[PDB]
Amino acid sequence: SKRYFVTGTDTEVGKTVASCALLQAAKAAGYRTAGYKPVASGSEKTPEGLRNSDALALQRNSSLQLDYATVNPYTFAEPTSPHIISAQEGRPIESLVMSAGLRALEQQADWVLVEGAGGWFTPLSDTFTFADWVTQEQLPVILVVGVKLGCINHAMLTAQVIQHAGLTLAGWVANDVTPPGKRHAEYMTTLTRMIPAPLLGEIPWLAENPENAATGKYINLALL
Amino acid sequence: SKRYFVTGTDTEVGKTVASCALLQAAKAAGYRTAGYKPVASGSEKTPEGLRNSDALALQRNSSLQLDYATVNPYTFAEPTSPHIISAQEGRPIESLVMSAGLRALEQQADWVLVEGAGGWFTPLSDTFTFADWVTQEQLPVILVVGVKLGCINHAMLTAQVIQHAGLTLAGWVANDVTPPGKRHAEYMTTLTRMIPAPLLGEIPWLAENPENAATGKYINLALL
Ligand SMILES: Nc1ncnc2c1ncn2[C@@H]1O[C@H](COP(=O)(O)OP(=O)(O)O)[C@@H](O)[C@H]1O
Ligand SMILES: Nc1ncnc2c1ncn2[C@@H]1O[C@H](COP(=O)(O)OP(=O)(O)O)[C@@H](O)[C@H]1O
Numbered sequence: 001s002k003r004y005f006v007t008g009t010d011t012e013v014g015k016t017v018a019s020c021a022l023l024q025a026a027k028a029a030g031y032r033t034a035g036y037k038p039v040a041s042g043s044e045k046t047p048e049g050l051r052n053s054d055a056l057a058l059q060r061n062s063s064l065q066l067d068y069a070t071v072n073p074y075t076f077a078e079p080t081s082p083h084i085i086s087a088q089e090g091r092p093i094e095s096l097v098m099s100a101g102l103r104a105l106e107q108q109a110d111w112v113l114v115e116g117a118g119g120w121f122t123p124l125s126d127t128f129t130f131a132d133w134v135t136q137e138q139l140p141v142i143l144v145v146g147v148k149l150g151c152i153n154h155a156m157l158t159a160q161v162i163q164h165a166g167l168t169l170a171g172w173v174a175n176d177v178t179p180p181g182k183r184h185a186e187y188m189t190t191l192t193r194m195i196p197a198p199l200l201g202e203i204p205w206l207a208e209n210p211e212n213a214a215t216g217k218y219i220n221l222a223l224l
Numbered sequence: 225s226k227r228y229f230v231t232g233t234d235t236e237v238g239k240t241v242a243s244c245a246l247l248q249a250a251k252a253a254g255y256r257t258a259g260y261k262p263v264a265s266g267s268e269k270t271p272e273g274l275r276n277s278d279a280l281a282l283q284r285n286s287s288l289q290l291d292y293a294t295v296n297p298y299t300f301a302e303p304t305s306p307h308i309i310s311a312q313e314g315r316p317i318e319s320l321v322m323s324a325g326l327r328a329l330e331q332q333a334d335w336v337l338v339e340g341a342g343g344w345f346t347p348l349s350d351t352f353t354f355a356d357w358v359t360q361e362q363l364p365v366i367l368v369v370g371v372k373l374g375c376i377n378h379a380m381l382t383a384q385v386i387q388h389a390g391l392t393l394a395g396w397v398a399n400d401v402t403p404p405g406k407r408h409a410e411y412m413t414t415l416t417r418m419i420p421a422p423l424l425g426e427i428p429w430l431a432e433n434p435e436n437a438a439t440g441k442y443i444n445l446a447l448l
Contacts (some may be wrong), residue, residue, distance in 0.1 A: 010234070011374040082375060084410045119377030123414065150235040152305060153343030157381040164388060186308045190347065 001106040002031075005114045005139040009154035014175035014203065015056040015147035017210045019115050021173070021203055022142070023061040024216025032064045037072045038098040039117045039124065042079030050075040054115065057211045064109055072215035073101050083123040093124045095133055102137070104176060120158050126170070131165065140170040142224075143195065146177040147187050147202075150169060152194065159195050169195075170224055174202040198223040225330040226255075227339045228394060228448070229363040230239050233378035237370035238399035238427065240278040241300040241434045243425055245397070247285040247368070247441025255335035257287045261296045262322040263341045263348065266303030274299040278339065281435045288333055297325050307347040317348045319357055326361070338363060342447075344382050355389065366448075367419065370401040371411050376418065382421050393419075393448055398426040422447040 006022070008015035019035060026033045035058025041052040042070070048068075055072035062071070074093055076085040086093050087201060103110050116122065122130040134141070141162050145155045154173070162169050172195050192199055201219040230246070232239035243259060250257045260283025267274040272292075279296035286295070300309040310317050329336050333421055340346065346354040360363070364388050369379045379396070386393050396419050398412060416423055427434070427442040 010378070038421040039327070055280075080373065080407050081411075083414070084407055117379075119374065121377040121380040123376065123418075126417075149304065150343065152347065152379075153345040154234070154378065157343075157378075157385055160385055160388070161381055164384070183304050183308055187305075190305070190307070193350075 001110050001112055001190070003102070003106075003112045003114065003139055004142050005116060005134050006142045006144060007116050007120050007158065008144045009119070009146060009151055009158055011118055013144055013151075013209070014177055015115065015144045016057050018144040018173045018175050018203060019093060019113055020057055020061040020211050020217035021219050022113055023058070023203070024214065025219040025221045026111045026113070027063045028216050029221050031063070032109050033111045033113070034105040034109035035059065035062050035067060035071060035113050035115065036102060036105055037117075039074045039082050039093055039130070040072050041074050041076040041082055041085055041117065045077070051075055057138050058113070058115060059195060064165070070101070070104060073097055078224045082117055082124060083125050086125070095128065095136065098133055099137065114217045130205055135165050135167060138167070142170050142200070143172040143197070144175055145172055145195075147184065147191070148177060152187065152190055155191060158192055163196070167199040171198045171200040173200050173219070176203060176205040179205050192216040200224065225334050225336055225435050227326070227330075227336045227338065227363055228357050228366050229340060230368060231340050231372050231382065233343070233370060233375055233381040233382055234369045235342055236369055237375075238401055238434070239339065239368045240281050241439070242368040242399050242427060243337055244281055244285040244435050245425070245439035245443050246337055247282070248438065249443040249445045250335045250337070251287045251441050253445050256288070256333050257335045257337070258290060258329040259283065259286050259295060259337050259339065260326060260329055261339045261341075262325055263298045263306050263317055263354070265300040265306055265309055265341065267299050267301045269301070275302055282326045282337070282339060286333075294325070294328060297321055298387035299304070305347060306341055307349050309350070316369050319352065319360065322357055323361065344385060359391060362391070364392040366394050366424070367396040368399055369396055369415060369419075370399050371408065371415070372401060375413065376414055379415060380418055383421070387420070393421040394419045395422045397424050397443070400427060400429040401427050424448065
């Protein structure tokens with residue numbers, strides 16, 4: 001099974017928008033796809049339980065028909081760091097459960113995209129971060145970068161930390177979170193020479209519901 | 225001369241507000257102080273030339289009477305990355321000039337605070353970053369962290385990168401950039417166990433002009 005972990009340079013850089021574009025491109029290449037969001041906070045109440053919008057986006061951009069709990073085993077209502085609300089609720093986030101869920105998806109999908117929560121160093125308990133699980137699983141990493149002032153620094157910090165952990169940085173995706181601005185081309189050129197991995201594509205600024213937008217065409221899956 | 229470099233977890237975390245609080249505390253301890261902002265972009269036109277507001281803040285929180293060019297030798301009008309506007313204007317940012325300016329201040333001040341521009345990895349040319357100069361000068365680093373969601377990840381990334389470069393992380397400052405929110409105490413506890421350096425103090429949310437506020441009392445200079 002090909003498997004990739006998707007992380008972002010900051011909260012709200014469009015990591016889910018880029019994950020839906022990647023899933024769309026993979027579907028278009030003929031893969032049987034599955035999105036996996038093991039941990040999610042910031043969720044709505046429904047008759048069936050708590051449902052997170054990013055996990056719902058991954059669920060319906062998957063080519064397989066998947067149950068929600070398969071896509072997102074840990075769901076918390078409050079939008080804070082997972083280790084805080086996990087401790088508040090008395091519901092430990094277990095590494096074994098996160099890994100069993102990924103194996104379960106590997107029985108039916110041959111292309112699996114794993115989306116983290118927040119940024120690289122999001123804590124899952126007081127002694128365990130998301131980065132620890134990713135390193136354990138030896139997942140190759142795709143970095144999503146929102147093209148804005150501040151992103152050069154954050155992209156460089158994240159890229160260096162992943163490489164220090166002995167992980168493969170598979171590529172990065174540029175996401176245009178704002179309208180056309182004055183130094184867009186120079187930011188793209190700087191980011192391209194400084195991130196030691198191929199740029200997989202750039203998603204334009206899309207004003208209406210970009211998660212449901214057909215964005216697979218912006219991704220060149222041949223560089224992965 | 226004691227010398228410290230101040231960096232931030234993200235643009236606009238209050239790195240200048242915390243620098244003014246640090247300068248105020250140092251003045252109160254009896255040091256002859258000087259703030260130094262070698263590179264600045266985002267500046268106003270005046271009869272005397274371009275003047276940057278952060279450098280002006282450092283200039284009048286210094287206990288010595290200093291000329292502006294002494295505090296800020298490189299001033300650019302456009303608020304973008306220094307390497308872009310430096311290249312546009314044909315005005316190279318020279319490491320020798322940045323270091324000569326710091327020595328000039330060391331002839332009259334015995335406590336010097338150096339403020340960077342942007343975050344840790346801000347490029348000054350295509351082959352040279354701010355981090356390269358700080359490592360060259362062997363400056364101890366103070367990290368300013370805005371207490372918000374996303375900051376745990378960014379504080380951990382910056383702290384790890386500084387330590388990998390063989391530099392001393394002297395301490396960190398918590399800056400409350402927003403009003404009292406629901407998980408403030410848990411964010412402060414997480415940040416305190418994860419940053420490998422002493423918390424020097426916490427600056428509260430101050431609605432009016434916090435650069436001119438008397439904030440030295442929030443800093444415990446004895447931990448530096
Ligand atoms: N390309 C884009 N164009 C317009 N809005 C975007 C784009 N990418 C992200 N956004 C918006 O930014 C917000 C966060 O996006 P999301 O994909 O959920 O990021 P993250 O997974 O990092 O939290 C959403 O409102 C989303 O619609
Ligand atoms: N403690 C605070 N209370 C209220 N506003 C703050 C506080 N700290 C920073 N700000 C505001 O945030 C903005 C950026 O602050 P600044 O010190 O210049 O940060 P930076 O040097 O990282 O750019 C300014 O408008 C500043 O007044």
